Amino acid sequence: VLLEVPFSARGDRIPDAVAELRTREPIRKVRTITGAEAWLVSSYALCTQVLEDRRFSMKETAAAGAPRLNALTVPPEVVNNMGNIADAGLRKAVMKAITPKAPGLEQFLRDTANSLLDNLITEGAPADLRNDFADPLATALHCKVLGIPQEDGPKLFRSLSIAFMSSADPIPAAKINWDRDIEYMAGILENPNITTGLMGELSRLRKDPAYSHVSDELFATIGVTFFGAGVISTGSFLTTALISLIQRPQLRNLLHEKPELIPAGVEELLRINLSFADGLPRLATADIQVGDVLVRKGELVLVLLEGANFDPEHFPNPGSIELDRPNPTSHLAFGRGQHFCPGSALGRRHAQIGIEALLKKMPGVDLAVPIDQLVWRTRFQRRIPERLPVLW
Ligand code: HEM
C-alpha cells in the first residue's frame, strides 16, 4: 500500500522510520486520512524550501476540490486568517497584544503556575500535569491575554478537543462549537467592561473610523482563533516538554540547580517536540521542483516538522538535548516564512515560566506510571497524553 500518514500518535519518541525516509526519500508520496495523495517532506533543506516559497500556499489548501490532509474545522475563509488580519491593517495591534512583555503578564503566569502546583501538592500524588497544570495554565494565560473573564476559560477550552481534531470528514460538533464561540466573542466586543488585552484593543479599533469597514466577523474570528491556537499549542507543548524533561533526570536536575539555563533548555525542548501530529499543509500553485520531485500545480505538500528538527545534517546528534548548540533557534517548531507563528514569544514564555515553577515546587517530579501507559490522543492535530500522572 501507499505509505499512510501520520505514522504514530505517540509524542514520546520519534519513529525510526522518519530517519530512513529522510535519508532515502526526503520528499515521498503518502496517503492522508481522507484518501488523498500528498508529498511528505522530511529534511531540513526541503522543509525550509517549501515554507519559504509562498507558491506553496496555505490559503489554497481550503479550495473546494483540493486534495486534503483532513477536513476543515473552520470556515474556508478563516484558513487565510492571518492574511485577513494583515489586509485589515490589524497585524501590529494583534502582535502588541500577545507579547509576553505586557505589564504584569509574566507575574500573572508565575502566580497562576505556583497556585496550580500548590493545589496539587495539597491534594497529594499522583497528579495529572496535563489536565490539572499545563492546560489550565495555558487557558488562564489566554484569558488574560484576550482580556476576557477567567471564569469563561474552561467552557472555551472544552471546544478544543473537537476544534483541533484531524478528521477524514466534517465534524458537526466543530461547527456547533465554532458558531457558539464566535457569538461569545461578538458579545465580548459589545461589552463595555472589556478594556484590556487583545479583545479590549479590538473593541476599541472596531469603533475607530480608521478601521470602520473591518467586519464584525473578522474581529470575533480573531478572538476565537487566537484563543484556540494559543491554548492548544501552549498546553500541548508544555505537556510533552514535561515528559521529555522527566525522561531526562540529569537535565531535570541541572535546570533545577541552574534555572538560568531554562530558556536554553526550552529552546531544545521546542526543537525535539513532537506536538504537531501532521505535517504543515500547503497546496502548490505552480509546478515546482523539490529535491528529486517535480511537484505539480494543485498537489498537496506536507512539511514534517520533526523531519527538519531531527535532521542530523543541521542538528548533529539530534536526539540529544544540548544547551550550547550554535544554531539553537533555527528549528522549525514555530514554522518558517510567511506563516511563522505570531505567538512564538508568548509560547516560549509560557513554557519557561511553567517549567521554572514546577522544578522549584516539585524538584523530584517523576512519572507515576510506566511511560508506555500514557494514552496518546488519536486523529488530532496535536500529539498529547490524555493524562500525565506524576509523583514527586
Ligand atoms: C509552544 C507554543 C506554540 C507552538 C509550538 C506553535 C506552533 C505553530 C506553528 C508550527 C505554526 C505554523 C503553521 C503553518 O505554517 O502551517 C503556527 C502558526 C500559528 N500560531 Fe502558533 N504555536 C505556539 C503558540 C501560539 C500562541 C501562544 C498563539 C496565539 C496566542 C499562536 C497562534 C498561531 C496562529 C494564529 C498561527 C497561524 C499563522 C498563519 O496562518 O500565518 N501560536 N504556530
Ligand SMILES: Fc1ccc(-c2ccc(/C=C/Cn3ccnc3)cc2)cc1
Ligand atoms: F469550535 C472551534 C473550531 C475551530 C477552532 C480553531 C481551529 C483552528 C485554528 C487555527 C489553526 C492554525 N494553526 C496552525 C498551527 N497552529 C495553529 C483556530 C481555531 C476553534 C473553535
